[PDB]
Design an enzyme around this catalytic site. Sequence first.
Site, short mmCIF file in Angstrom:
data_model
loop_
_atom_site.label_atom_id
_atom_site.label_comp_id
_atom_site.label_asym_id
_atom_site.label_seq_id
_atom_site.Cartn_x
_atom_site.Cartn_y
_atom_site.Cartn_z
N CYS A 159 2.21 -1.74 -21.52
CA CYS A 159 1.14 -2.69 -21.86
C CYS A 159 0.16 -2.20 -22.92
O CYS A 159 -0.61 -3.01 -23.44
CB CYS A 159 0.34 -3.05 -20.60
N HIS A 284 -8.89 -6.13 -20.04
CA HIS A 284 -7.46 -6.18 -19.78
C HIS A 284 -7.16 -7.32 -18.82
O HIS A 284 -6.40 -8.24 -19.14
CB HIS A 284 -6.97 -4.83 -19.24
N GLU A 295 -10.85 -2.14 -13.03
CA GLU A 295 -11.45 -2.33 -14.34
C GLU A 295 -12.94 -2.65 -14.24
O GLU A 295 -13.75 -2.11 -14.99
CB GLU A 295 -10.74 -3.44 -15.11
N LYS A 314 -6.07 -13.55 -20.57
CA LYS A 314 -4.66 -13.57 -20.18
C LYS A 314 -4.27 -14.86 -19.46
O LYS A 314 -3.07 -15.12 -19.31
CB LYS A 314 -4.34 -12.34 -19.34
N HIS A 319 -0.02 -12.27 -20.01
CA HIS A 319 0.00 -10.84 -20.25
C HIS A 319 1.15 -10.58 -21.21
O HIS A 319 2.32 -10.65 -20.83
CB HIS A 319 0.17 -10.07 -18.94
N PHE A 379 1.20 0.88 -17.57
CA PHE A 379 2.00 1.70 -16.68
C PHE A 379 1.98 3.17 -17.12
O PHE A 379 1.75 3.50 -18.29
CB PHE A 379 3.45 1.21 -16.64
#
Lengths: 390, 203
Positions: A159, A284, A295, A314, A319, A379
Amino acid sequence: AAPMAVGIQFSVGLSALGCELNQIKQALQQPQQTLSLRDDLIADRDVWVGQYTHPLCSSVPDAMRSVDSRNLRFALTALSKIETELKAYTASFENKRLAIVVGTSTSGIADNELLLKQYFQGQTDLSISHYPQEMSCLAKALQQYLGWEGPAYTISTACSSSAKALAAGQRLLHADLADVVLVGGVDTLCKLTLNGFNSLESLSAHICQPCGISRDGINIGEAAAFFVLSKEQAPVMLMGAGETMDAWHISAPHPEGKGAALAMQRALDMAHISAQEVGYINLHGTATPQNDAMEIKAVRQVFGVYQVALSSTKHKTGHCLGAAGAIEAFICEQVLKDQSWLPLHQNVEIDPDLVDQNYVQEAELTQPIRYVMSNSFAFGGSNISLVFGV
Amino acid sequence: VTLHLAHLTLTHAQPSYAALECIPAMQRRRLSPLAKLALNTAISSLDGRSADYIVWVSKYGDEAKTLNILQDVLNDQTPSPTQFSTSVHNAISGLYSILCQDDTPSTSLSCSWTEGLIEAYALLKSMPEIKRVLVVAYDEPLPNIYAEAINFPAYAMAAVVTLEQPNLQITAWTHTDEAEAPAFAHFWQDADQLTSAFGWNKC
Protein backbone atom coordinates in the site's frame (compact mmCIF):
# COMPACT_ATOMS: atom_id res chain seq x y z
CA ALA A 1 13.40 27.22 3.51
CA ALA A 2 12.81 23.49 3.04
CA PRO A 3 16.07 22.06 1.61
CA MET A 4 14.42 18.96 0.09
CA ALA A 5 11.51 20.74 -1.62
CA VAL A 6 10.79 19.69 -5.20
CA GLY A 7 8.20 21.24 -7.50
CA ILE A 8 5.29 19.34 -9.03
CA GLN A 9 5.59 20.59 -12.63
CA PHE A 10 2.89 18.33 -14.14
CA SER A 11 0.41 15.85 -12.68
CA VAL A 12 -2.39 13.49 -13.69
CA GLY A 13 -4.76 11.36 -11.63
CA LEU A 14 -7.09 8.75 -13.12
CA SER A 15 -9.36 6.85 -10.71
CA ALA A 16 -13.01 6.21 -9.79
CA LEU A 17 -13.23 10.02 -9.30
CA GLY A 18 -13.20 10.56 -13.07
CA CYS A 19 -10.90 11.47 -15.93
CA GLU A 20 -11.23 15.29 -16.16
CA LEU A 21 -10.04 17.72 -13.50
CA ASN A 22 -13.46 19.37 -13.04
CA GLN A 23 -15.21 16.01 -12.53
CA ILE A 24 -12.68 14.83 -9.95
CA LYS A 25 -12.96 17.99 -7.87
CA GLN A 26 -16.78 17.81 -7.83
CA ALA A 27 -16.69 14.14 -6.82
CA LEU A 28 -14.53 14.97 -3.80
CA GLN A 29 -16.58 18.03 -2.79
CA GLN A 30 -19.98 16.29 -2.92
CA PRO A 31 -21.44 13.10 -1.46
CA GLN A 32 -21.22 11.48 -4.89
CA GLN A 33 -21.23 7.70 -4.81
CA THR A 34 -18.28 6.89 -7.08
CA LEU A 35 -17.77 3.19 -6.40
CA SER A 36 -19.06 0.50 -8.77
CA LEU A 37 -20.47 -2.98 -8.17
CA ARG A 38 -18.66 -5.97 -9.67
CA ASP A 39 -19.93 -9.56 -9.73
CA ASP A 40 -16.86 -11.06 -11.48
CA LEU A 41 -14.07 -10.58 -8.93
CA ILE A 42 -15.15 -12.79 -5.99
CA ALA A 43 -17.17 -15.95 -6.50
CA ASP A 44 -20.73 -15.91 -5.13
CA ARG A 45 -20.55 -12.26 -4.10
CA ASP A 46 -20.75 -8.70 -5.40
CA VAL A 47 -18.15 -6.16 -4.25
CA TRP A 48 -18.02 -2.38 -4.38
CA VAL A 49 -14.78 -1.31 -6.05
CA GLY A 50 -13.14 1.90 -7.14
CA GLN A 51 -13.33 1.18 -10.87
CA TYR A 52 -11.92 3.46 -13.57
CA THR A 53 -15.16 3.62 -15.57
CA HIS A 54 -13.72 5.09 -18.77
CA PRO A 55 -12.11 3.53 -21.84
CA LEU A 56 -8.43 2.78 -22.01
CA CYS A 57 -6.22 3.23 -25.05
CA SER A 58 -6.94 0.32 -27.35
CA SER A 59 -3.27 -0.10 -28.24
CA VAL A 60 0.24 -0.07 -26.85
CA PRO A 61 3.02 0.99 -29.34
CA ASP A 62 4.34 -1.72 -31.64
CA ALA A 63 7.72 -2.06 -29.91
CA MET A 64 5.94 -2.64 -26.58
CA ARG A 65 3.48 -5.38 -27.64
CA SER A 66 5.32 -7.94 -25.48
CA VAL A 67 4.37 -6.10 -22.26
CA ASP A 68 0.81 -5.07 -23.18
CA SER A 69 -1.70 -5.29 -20.32
CA ARG A 70 -4.64 -3.32 -18.97
CA ASN A 71 -2.30 -1.96 -16.26
CA LEU A 72 0.12 -0.57 -18.85
CA ARG A 73 -2.75 0.79 -20.96
CA PHE A 74 -4.05 2.54 -17.83
CA ALA A 75 -0.56 3.97 -17.25
CA LEU A 76 -0.24 5.22 -20.84
CA THR A 77 -3.77 6.67 -20.79
CA ALA A 78 -2.77 8.78 -17.78
CA LEU A 79 0.62 9.72 -19.19
CA SER A 80 -0.83 10.89 -22.50
CA LYS A 81 -2.85 13.57 -20.67
CA ILE A 82 0.46 15.37 -19.93
CA GLU A 83 2.76 13.89 -22.59
CA THR A 84 2.66 16.80 -25.07
CA GLU A 85 3.45 19.47 -22.48
CA LEU A 86 5.96 17.12 -20.83
CA LYS A 87 7.96 16.64 -24.05
CA ALA A 88 8.07 20.42 -24.52
CA TYR A 89 9.32 20.69 -20.94
CA THR A 90 12.00 17.99 -21.03
CA ALA A 91 13.62 19.34 -24.22
CA SER A 92 15.96 21.54 -22.17
CA PHE A 93 17.43 18.70 -20.08
CA GLU A 94 19.80 15.92 -21.11
CA ASN A 95 18.07 12.59 -21.84
CA LYS A 96 20.22 10.77 -19.26
CA ARG A 97 18.93 13.17 -16.55
CA LEU A 98 15.24 12.20 -16.97
CA ALA A 99 14.42 9.52 -14.40
CA ILE A 100 11.41 7.36 -13.51
CA VAL A 101 10.42 5.88 -10.15
CA VAL A 102 6.95 4.36 -9.98
CA GLY A 103 5.08 2.02 -7.65
CA THR A 104 2.75 -0.89 -8.31
CA SER A 105 1.47 -3.92 -6.44
CA THR A 106 -0.33 -5.53 -9.42
CA SER A 107 1.55 -4.73 -12.62
CA GLY A 108 -0.24 -6.62 -15.39
CA ILE A 109 -1.25 -9.68 -13.35
CA ALA A 110 -4.92 -9.23 -14.31
CA ASP A 111 -4.14 -10.09 -17.94
CA ASN A 112 -2.61 -13.47 -17.03
CA GLU A 113 -5.37 -14.63 -14.67
CA LEU A 114 -7.40 -15.87 -17.65
CA LEU A 115 -4.58 -17.97 -19.13
CA LEU A 116 -3.58 -19.31 -15.71
CA LYS A 117 -7.16 -20.44 -15.09
CA GLN A 118 -7.15 -22.27 -18.43
CA TYR A 119 -3.82 -23.84 -17.49
CA PHE A 120 -5.19 -25.07 -14.15
CA GLN A 121 -8.41 -26.38 -15.74
CA GLY A 122 -6.97 -28.50 -18.55
CA GLN A 123 -4.88 -27.00 -21.34
CA THR A 124 -1.53 -27.92 -19.73
CA ASP A 125 0.38 -27.07 -22.95
CA LEU A 126 -0.03 -23.29 -23.19
CA SER A 127 2.88 -20.86 -22.83
CA ILE A 128 2.03 -17.88 -20.63
CA SER A 129 4.41 -14.93 -20.73
CA HIS A 130 5.62 -13.62 -17.35
CA TYR A 131 7.19 -10.22 -18.08
CA PRO A 132 3.88 -8.25 -18.45
CA GLN A 133 3.05 -9.14 -14.84
CA GLU A 134 6.51 -8.41 -13.36
CA MET A 135 6.68 -5.34 -11.15
CA SER A 136 9.75 -3.93 -12.96
CA CYS A 137 7.80 -3.95 -16.25
CA LEU A 138 6.02 -0.72 -15.28
CA ALA A 139 9.04 1.61 -15.00
CA LYS A 140 10.78 0.00 -17.99
CA ALA A 141 7.67 0.24 -20.20
CA LEU A 142 7.22 3.90 -19.26
CA GLN A 143 10.91 4.54 -19.95
CA GLN A 144 10.67 2.94 -23.39
CA TYR A 145 7.50 4.92 -24.13
CA LEU A 146 9.08 8.29 -23.27
CA GLY A 147 12.57 7.52 -24.57
CA TRP A 148 14.16 8.70 -21.34
CA GLU A 149 17.63 7.51 -20.36
CA GLY A 150 18.00 8.22 -16.65
CA PRO A 151 17.46 5.48 -14.09
CA ALA A 152 14.05 3.82 -14.17
CA TYR A 153 12.87 1.40 -11.53
CA THR A 154 9.79 0.17 -9.71
CA ILE A 155 8.93 0.21 -5.99
CA SER A 156 6.68 -2.61 -4.79
CA THR A 157 5.86 -2.24 -1.08
CA ALA A 158 2.12 -3.02 -1.10
CA CYS A 159 0.00 0.00 0.00
CA SER A 160 2.93 2.43 0.36
CA SER A 161 4.45 1.77 -3.09
CA SER A 162 3.59 4.97 -4.93
CA ALA A 163 4.01 7.30 -1.94
CA LYS A 164 7.52 5.90 -1.52
CA ALA A 165 8.04 6.54 -5.25
CA LEU A 166 7.34 10.26 -4.74
CA ALA A 167 9.85 10.30 -1.87
CA ALA A 168 12.38 8.42 -4.03
CA GLY A 169 12.08 10.98 -6.83
CA GLN A 170 12.60 13.83 -4.37
CA ARG A 171 15.85 12.14 -3.27
CA LEU A 172 17.03 11.54 -6.85
CA LEU A 173 16.70 15.28 -7.49
CA HIS A 174 18.58 16.39 -4.38
CA ALA A 175 21.26 13.73 -4.90
CA ASP A 176 22.00 15.35 -8.30
CA LEU A 177 21.15 12.13 -10.15
CA ALA A 178 18.33 13.61 -12.24
CA ASP A 179 16.89 16.97 -13.22
CA VAL A 180 13.36 15.60 -13.84
CA VAL A 181 11.69 12.53 -12.29
CA LEU A 182 8.39 10.99 -13.31
CA VAL A 183 6.89 9.46 -10.15
CA GLY A 184 3.63 7.87 -9.06
CA GLY A 185 1.91 4.52 -9.45
CA VAL A 186 -0.66 2.43 -11.25
CA ASP A 187 -2.63 -0.54 -9.95
CA THR A 188 -5.54 -2.32 -11.64
CA LEU A 189 -8.35 -4.44 -10.22
CA CYS A 190 -7.74 -8.18 -10.33
CA LYS A 191 -8.93 -11.41 -8.73
CA LEU A 192 -5.66 -11.87 -6.83
CA THR A 193 -5.99 -8.70 -4.73
CA LEU A 194 -9.75 -8.91 -4.19
CA ASN A 195 -9.57 -12.52 -3.01
CA GLY A 196 -6.30 -12.09 -1.15
CA PHE A 197 -7.76 -9.30 0.94
CA ASN A 198 -11.05 -11.19 1.31
CA SER A 199 -9.15 -14.11 2.87
CA LEU A 200 -7.76 -11.67 5.45
CA GLU A 201 -11.36 -10.54 6.11
CA SER A 202 -10.23 -7.03 5.14
CA LEU A 203 -13.09 -6.25 2.72
CA SER A 204 -16.28 -4.43 3.66
CA ALA A 205 -19.64 -6.07 3.03
CA HIS A 206 -20.82 -2.87 1.34
CA ILE A 207 -19.24 0.59 1.00
CA CYS A 208 -16.41 1.32 3.43
CA GLN A 209 -16.91 3.72 6.36
CA PRO A 210 -13.52 5.17 7.31
CA CYS A 211 -13.31 5.78 11.08
CA GLY A 212 -16.93 4.66 11.35
CA ILE A 213 -18.40 3.25 14.55
CA SER A 214 -19.31 -0.02 12.76
CA ARG A 215 -16.59 0.01 10.07
CA ASP A 216 -15.94 -3.41 8.56
CA GLY A 217 -13.08 -3.16 6.07
CA ILE A 218 -12.01 -1.71 2.77
CA ASN A 219 -13.06 -1.38 -0.82
CA ILE A 220 -10.31 -1.92 -3.36
CA GLY A 221 -9.84 0.61 -6.15
CA GLU A 222 -7.65 1.15 -9.18
CA ALA A 223 -5.77 4.33 -10.05
CA ALA A 224 -3.09 5.70 -12.36
CA ALA A 225 -1.46 8.86 -11.03
CA PHE A 226 1.80 10.55 -12.05
CA PHE A 227 3.80 13.62 -11.09
CA VAL A 228 6.67 15.29 -12.90
CA LEU A 229 9.10 16.57 -10.24
CA SER A 230 12.04 18.95 -10.64
CA LYS A 231 14.13 21.12 -8.34
CA GLU A 232 12.42 24.21 -9.79
CA GLN A 233 9.54 26.06 -8.19
CA ALA A 234 5.97 25.05 -8.95
CA PRO A 235 2.50 26.01 -7.67
CA VAL A 236 2.67 23.02 -5.29
CA MET A 237 5.84 21.49 -3.93
CA LEU A 238 6.64 18.17 -2.32
CA MET A 239 8.38 19.35 0.82
CA GLY A 240 8.90 16.40 3.13
CA ALA A 241 8.67 12.65 3.44
CA GLY A 242 8.88 10.45 6.53
CA GLU A 243 9.41 6.68 6.35
CA THR A 244 9.40 4.13 9.18
CA MET A 245 8.87 0.42 9.80
CA ASP A 246 6.60 -0.92 12.58
CA ALA A 247 8.56 -4.19 12.99
CA TRP A 248 5.41 -5.48 14.70
CA HIS A 249 3.28 -7.85 12.57
CA ILE A 250 3.24 -9.01 8.96
CA SER A 251 -0.35 -7.81 8.37
CA ALA A 252 -1.58 -5.84 11.44
CA PRO A 253 -0.39 -2.34 12.39
CA HIS A 254 1.34 -1.45 15.62
CA PRO A 255 -1.65 -0.90 17.94
CA GLU A 256 -0.23 2.31 19.48
CA GLY A 257 0.62 3.76 16.06
CA LYS A 258 4.27 4.24 16.99
CA GLY A 259 5.45 3.74 13.41
CA ALA A 260 2.76 5.98 11.90
CA ALA A 261 3.32 8.80 14.41
CA LEU A 262 7.06 8.76 13.74
CA ALA A 263 6.54 8.82 9.96
CA MET A 264 4.32 11.88 10.31
CA GLN A 265 6.82 13.65 12.57
CA ARG A 266 9.72 12.92 10.23
CA ALA A 267 7.75 14.36 7.33
CA LEU A 268 7.16 17.57 9.29
CA ASP A 269 10.84 17.74 10.24
CA MET A 270 12.04 17.32 6.64
CA ALA A 271 9.57 19.99 5.49
CA HIS A 272 10.83 22.32 8.30
CA ILE A 273 7.28 22.87 9.61
CA SER A 274 5.46 22.24 12.86
CA ALA A 275 2.25 20.22 13.21
CA GLN A 276 0.34 23.48 13.80
CA GLU A 277 1.16 24.69 10.29
CA VAL A 278 -0.65 21.77 8.57
CA GLY A 279 -4.10 22.74 7.29
CA TYR A 280 -5.34 19.32 6.15
CA ILE A 281 -4.42 15.63 6.53
CA ASN A 282 -5.53 13.06 3.96
CA LEU A 283 -5.69 9.97 6.17
CA HIS A 284 -4.71 6.52 5.08
CA GLY A 285 -8.13 5.76 6.55
CA THR A 286 -8.86 2.37 5.00
CA ALA A 287 -11.86 1.59 7.30
CA THR A 288 -10.51 -1.57 8.84
CA PRO A 289 -10.91 -1.61 12.63
CA GLN A 290 -7.15 -1.87 13.20
CA ASN A 291 -5.92 0.81 10.81
CA ASP A 292 -8.21 3.67 11.75
CA ALA A 293 -7.81 3.05 15.51
CA MET A 294 -4.02 3.05 15.17
CA GLU A 295 -3.92 6.02 12.79
CA ILE A 296 -6.09 8.38 14.83
CA LYS A 297 -3.97 7.53 17.89
CA ALA A 298 -0.90 8.58 15.91
CA VAL A 299 -2.63 11.73 14.62
CA ARG A 300 -3.58 12.67 18.19
CA GLN A 301 0.02 12.08 19.31
CA VAL A 302 1.46 14.42 16.64
CA PHE A 303 -1.35 16.94 16.10
CA GLY A 304 -3.39 16.87 19.30
CA VAL A 305 -7.16 17.15 19.58
CA TYR A 306 -9.50 19.11 17.26
CA GLN A 307 -6.51 20.89 15.68
CA VAL A 308 -6.45 19.93 11.98
CA ALA A 309 -9.02 19.21 9.28
CA LEU A 310 -8.81 15.67 8.03
CA SER A 311 -10.61 13.11 5.94
CA SER A 312 -10.19 9.77 4.26
CA THR A 313 -11.04 9.69 0.55
CA LYS A 314 -10.96 5.89 0.26
CA HIS A 315 -14.76 5.81 0.17
CA LYS A 316 -14.43 7.68 -3.17
CA THR A 317 -11.36 6.14 -4.81
CA GLY A 318 -11.35 2.86 -2.93
CA HIS A 319 -8.11 1.62 -1.40
CA CYS A 320 -5.97 1.73 -4.54
CA LEU A 321 -3.21 -0.33 -2.89
CA GLY A 322 0.09 0.34 -4.72
CA ALA A 323 -1.42 3.46 -6.29
CA ALA A 324 -3.08 4.79 -3.10
CA GLY A 325 -0.33 7.24 -2.23
CA ALA A 326 -0.10 8.72 -5.73
CA ILE A 327 -3.82 9.31 -6.24
CA GLU A 328 -4.04 10.77 -2.73
CA ALA A 329 -1.07 13.06 -3.43
CA PHE A 330 -2.94 14.23 -6.54
CA ILE A 331 -5.94 15.16 -4.40
CA CYS A 332 -3.64 16.99 -1.99
CA GLU A 333 -2.10 18.98 -4.86
CA GLN A 334 -5.51 20.09 -6.16
CA VAL A 335 -6.58 21.16 -2.68
CA LEU A 336 -3.49 23.38 -2.41
CA LYS A 337 -3.84 24.75 -5.93
CA ASP A 338 -7.52 25.73 -5.55
CA GLN A 339 -7.65 27.19 -1.99
CA SER A 340 -11.37 26.59 -2.07
CA TRP A 341 -12.42 23.14 -0.89
CA LEU A 342 -11.45 20.13 1.18
CA PRO A 343 -12.41 16.52 0.34
CA LEU A 344 -15.48 15.32 2.24
CA HIS A 345 -15.13 12.55 4.78
CA GLN A 346 -17.70 9.76 4.55
CA ASN A 347 -20.92 10.87 6.23
CA VAL A 348 -20.96 8.25 8.99
CA GLU A 349 -21.18 8.08 12.76
CA ILE A 350 -17.58 8.33 13.92
CA ASP A 351 -16.24 5.75 16.37
CA PRO A 352 -16.35 7.42 19.83
CA ASP A 353 -12.65 6.55 20.27
CA LEU A 354 -11.82 8.60 17.14
CA VAL A 355 -14.33 11.46 17.31
CA ASP A 356 -12.01 14.10 18.82
CA GLN A 357 -10.82 15.35 15.39
CA ASN A 358 -12.13 17.83 12.81
CA TYR A 359 -13.40 15.49 10.10
CA VAL A 360 -14.28 17.32 6.89
CA GLN A 361 -18.09 17.43 6.90
CA GLU A 362 -18.57 20.23 4.42
CA ALA A 363 -16.34 21.08 1.49
CA GLU A 364 -15.95 24.87 1.82
CA LEU A 365 -12.48 25.94 2.89
CA THR A 366 -12.86 29.12 4.94
CA GLN A 367 -9.17 30.16 5.44
CA PRO A 368 -6.21 29.62 3.09
CA ILE A 369 -3.86 26.76 3.91
CA ARG A 370 -0.17 26.36 3.13
CA TYR A 371 0.60 22.71 3.97
CA VAL A 372 -1.15 19.37 3.57
CA MET A 373 -0.13 15.88 4.70
CA SER A 374 -0.97 12.45 3.28
CA ASN A 375 -0.42 9.09 5.01
CA SER A 376 0.10 5.58 3.62
CA PHE A 377 0.47 2.65 6.04
CA ALA A 378 1.10 -0.71 4.37
CA PHE A 379 1.78 -4.40 4.94
CA GLY A 380 5.04 -5.36 6.55
CA GLY A 381 4.67 -2.26 8.72
CA SER A 382 5.87 0.02 5.91
CA ASN A 383 4.79 3.59 6.76
CA ILE A 384 5.22 6.86 4.89
CA SER A 385 3.80 10.35 5.30
CA LEU A 386 4.19 13.10 2.68
CA VAL A 387 4.00 16.87 3.26
CA PHE A 388 3.02 19.23 0.42
CA GLY A 389 3.11 23.03 0.46
CA VAL A 390 2.73 26.13 -1.68
CA VAL B 1 27.39 7.87 -8.78
CA THR B 2 30.37 6.79 -6.67
CA LEU B 3 30.04 4.55 -3.63
CA HIS B 4 32.15 2.77 -1.08
CA LEU B 5 30.96 -0.85 -1.15
CA ALA B 6 31.94 -3.33 1.55
CA HIS B 7 30.97 -6.71 3.05
CA LEU B 8 29.79 -8.15 -0.27
CA THR B 9 28.24 -11.57 0.43
CA LEU B 10 26.66 -13.94 -2.11
CA THR B 11 24.66 -16.85 -0.66
CA HIS B 12 23.18 -19.90 -2.41
CA ALA B 13 20.89 -22.63 -1.11
CA GLN B 14 22.16 -24.38 2.02
CA PRO B 15 20.82 -27.16 4.25
CA SER B 16 21.21 -24.84 7.25
CA TYR B 17 22.01 -21.17 7.77
CA ALA B 18 24.40 -20.14 10.54
CA ALA B 19 23.30 -16.48 10.54
CA LEU B 20 19.66 -17.49 11.18
CA GLU B 21 20.49 -18.88 14.64
CA CYS B 22 19.38 -15.59 16.23
CA ILE B 23 15.80 -16.29 15.07
CA PRO B 24 13.88 -18.80 17.21
CA ALA B 25 13.63 -22.11 15.39
CA MET B 26 9.80 -22.21 15.31
CA GLN B 27 9.57 -19.02 13.22
CA ARG B 28 12.79 -19.80 11.36
CA ARG B 29 11.23 -23.02 10.09
CA ARG B 30 8.24 -21.15 8.66
CA LEU B 31 10.36 -18.93 6.41
CA SER B 32 10.13 -19.83 2.74
CA PRO B 33 13.41 -21.02 1.18
CA LEU B 34 13.85 -17.61 -0.47
CA ALA B 35 13.14 -15.79 2.81
CA LYS B 36 15.86 -17.87 4.51
CA LEU B 37 18.37 -16.94 1.81
CA ALA B 38 17.58 -13.22 1.96
CA LEU B 39 17.55 -12.91 5.76
CA ASN B 40 20.73 -15.00 6.14
CA THR B 41 22.60 -12.77 3.69
CA ALA B 42 21.27 -9.56 5.27
CA ILE B 43 22.51 -10.58 8.72
CA SER B 44 25.84 -11.81 7.31
CA SER B 45 26.64 -8.58 5.47
CA LEU B 46 25.67 -6.47 8.48
CA ASP B 47 28.20 -8.51 10.49
CA GLY B 48 26.84 -7.26 13.81
CA ARG B 49 26.73 -3.63 12.63
CA SER B 50 23.58 -1.68 11.78
CA ALA B 51 22.29 0.32 8.83
CA ASP B 52 20.31 3.53 8.50
CA TYR B 53 18.20 2.22 5.59
CA ILE B 54 17.71 -1.12 3.82
CA VAL B 55 17.10 -1.50 0.10
CA TRP B 56 15.68 -4.93 -0.79
CA VAL B 57 15.84 -5.85 -4.49
CA SER B 58 14.07 -8.72 -6.26
CA LYS B 59 12.99 -9.04 -9.90
CA TYR B 60 10.37 -11.74 -9.26
CA GLY B 61 9.66 -12.02 -5.56
CA ASP B 62 8.19 -15.38 -4.50
CA GLU B 63 6.42 -16.28 -7.73
CA ALA B 64 5.96 -19.89 -6.60
CA LYS B 65 3.87 -18.80 -3.60
CA THR B 66 1.81 -16.38 -5.71
CA LEU B 67 1.12 -19.24 -8.14
CA ASN B 68 -0.37 -21.46 -5.42
CA ILE B 69 -2.58 -18.61 -4.17
CA LEU B 70 -3.75 -17.92 -7.73
CA GLN B 71 -4.72 -21.55 -8.23
CA ASP B 72 -7.09 -21.34 -5.26
CA VAL B 73 -8.44 -17.96 -6.42
CA LEU B 74 -9.00 -19.11 -10.00
CA ASN B 75 -10.68 -22.26 -8.63
CA ASP B 76 -13.16 -20.04 -6.70
CA GLN B 77 -11.59 -21.06 -3.38
CA THR B 78 -10.55 -18.57 -0.74
CA PRO B 79 -6.73 -18.60 -0.51
CA SER B 80 -4.66 -18.99 2.64
CA PRO B 81 -4.44 -15.60 4.40
CA THR B 82 -0.97 -16.19 5.86
CA GLN B 83 0.32 -17.24 2.43
CA PHE B 84 -1.17 -14.13 0.81
CA SER B 85 0.19 -11.77 3.47
CA THR B 86 3.68 -13.29 3.05
CA SER B 87 3.42 -13.26 -0.78
CA VAL B 88 3.52 -9.47 -1.22
CA HIS B 89 6.71 -8.15 -2.78
CA ASN B 90 7.91 -6.53 0.47
CA ALA B 91 7.07 -9.51 2.72
CA ILE B 92 10.74 -10.43 3.23
CA SER B 93 11.61 -6.88 4.32
CA GLY B 94 8.75 -7.11 6.81
CA LEU B 95 9.81 -10.56 8.01
CA TYR B 96 13.38 -9.35 8.51
CA SER B 97 12.20 -6.37 10.53
CA ILE B 98 10.01 -8.48 12.83
CA LEU B 99 12.13 -11.59 13.34
CA CYS B 100 15.38 -9.66 13.80
CA GLN B 101 13.67 -6.83 15.71
CA ASP B 102 15.20 -4.18 13.41
CA ASP B 103 12.87 -1.27 12.64
CA THR B 104 15.37 0.31 10.22
CA PRO B 105 13.42 2.07 7.41
CA SER B 106 13.36 0.11 4.19
CA THR B 107 12.13 -0.14 0.61
CA SER B 108 11.52 -3.05 -1.74
CA LEU B 109 12.31 -2.66 -5.42
CA SER B 110 11.80 -4.70 -8.58
CA CYS B 111 14.89 -3.82 -10.62
CA SER B 112 18.53 -4.76 -11.22
CA TRP B 113 21.49 -4.61 -8.83
CA THR B 114 22.66 -1.31 -10.35
CA GLU B 115 19.36 0.47 -9.64
CA GLY B 116 19.40 -0.80 -6.06
CA LEU B 117 22.82 0.83 -5.72
CA ILE B 118 21.44 4.00 -7.32
CA GLU B 119 18.61 4.08 -4.79
CA ALA B 120 21.19 3.61 -2.00
CA TYR B 121 23.34 6.47 -3.33
CA ALA B 122 20.32 8.77 -3.51
CA LEU B 123 19.44 7.93 0.11
CA LEU B 124 23.01 8.58 1.33
CA LYS B 125 23.58 11.71 -0.75
CA SER B 126 20.27 13.45 -0.01
CA MET B 127 19.63 12.42 3.63
CA PRO B 128 22.11 13.71 6.25
CA GLU B 129 20.99 11.16 8.83
CA ILE B 130 21.50 8.19 6.47
CA LYS B 131 25.17 7.21 6.52
CA ARG B 132 25.13 3.44 5.86
CA VAL B 133 22.73 1.63 3.51
CA LEU B 134 22.30 -2.14 3.28
CA VAL B 135 21.39 -3.42 -0.21
CA VAL B 136 20.04 -6.99 -0.45
CA ALA B 137 19.16 -8.63 -3.77
CA TYR B 138 17.49 -12.03 -4.03
CA ASP B 139 15.70 -14.21 -6.57
CA GLU B 140 14.80 -17.78 -7.44
CA PRO B 141 13.91 -19.09 -10.91
CA LEU B 142 10.39 -18.73 -12.31
CA PRO B 143 7.86 -21.58 -12.33
CA ASN B 144 8.33 -23.46 -15.61
CA ILE B 145 4.71 -22.67 -16.54
CA TYR B 146 6.05 -19.33 -17.86
CA ALA B 147 7.60 -19.11 -21.33
CA GLU B 148 10.65 -17.12 -20.18
CA ALA B 149 11.37 -19.47 -17.27
CA ILE B 150 15.04 -20.46 -17.07
CA ASN B 151 16.69 -22.36 -14.24
CA PHE B 152 19.42 -20.71 -12.18
CA PRO B 153 20.59 -21.36 -8.62
CA ALA B 154 18.53 -19.30 -6.19
CA TYR B 155 20.61 -16.61 -4.51
CA ALA B 156 20.80 -13.65 -2.19
CA MET B 157 23.53 -11.01 -2.36
CA ALA B 158 24.05 -8.16 0.10
CA ALA B 159 26.50 -5.36 0.74
CA VAL B 160 26.89 -2.26 2.92
CA VAL B 161 27.21 1.01 1.03
CA THR B 162 28.51 4.39 2.23
CA LEU B 163 29.62 7.62 0.53
CA GLU B 164 33.13 8.42 1.79
CA GLN B 165 36.28 7.26 0.02
CA PRO B 166 34.39 5.46 -2.77
CA ASN B 167 35.79 2.29 -4.32
CA LEU B 168 32.99 1.85 -6.88
CA GLN B 169 31.74 4.08 -9.68
CA ILE B 170 28.63 3.55 -11.82
CA THR B 171 29.06 5.08 -15.26
CA ALA B 172 26.02 3.73 -17.09
CA TRP B 173 22.46 2.93 -16.04
CA THR B 174 20.20 2.67 -19.12
CA HIS B 175 21.26 -0.88 -20.16
CA THR B 176 20.87 -2.42 -16.72
CA ASP B 177 20.19 -5.57 -18.32
CA GLU B 178 21.85 -8.75 -17.28
CA ALA B 179 23.62 -6.22 -14.89
CA GLU B 180 22.41 -8.54 -12.09
CA ALA B 181 23.93 -9.32 -8.70
CA PRO B 182 25.80 -12.50 -9.82
CA ALA B 183 27.56 -10.63 -12.65
CA PHE B 184 28.45 -7.91 -10.14
CA ALA B 185 29.95 -10.42 -7.69
CA HIS B 186 32.10 -11.89 -10.48
CA PHE B 187 33.35 -8.39 -11.34
CA TRP B 188 33.80 -7.29 -7.72
CA GLN B 189 35.78 -10.37 -6.64
CA ASP B 190 38.13 -10.42 -9.67
CA ALA B 191 41.17 -8.54 -8.38
CA ASP B 192 42.51 -7.95 -11.93
CA GLN B 193 39.20 -6.66 -13.38
CA LEU B 194 38.95 -2.87 -12.97
CA THR B 195 36.03 -2.06 -15.32
CA SER B 196 32.87 -3.85 -16.44
CA ALA B 197 30.92 -3.53 -19.67
CA PHE B 198 27.81 -3.26 -17.47
CA GLY B 199 29.00 0.22 -16.45
CA TRP B 200 30.88 -0.41 -13.18
CA ASN B 201 34.44 0.66 -12.40
CA LYS B 202 36.66 0.22 -9.36
CA CYS B 203 38.37 3.36 -8.08
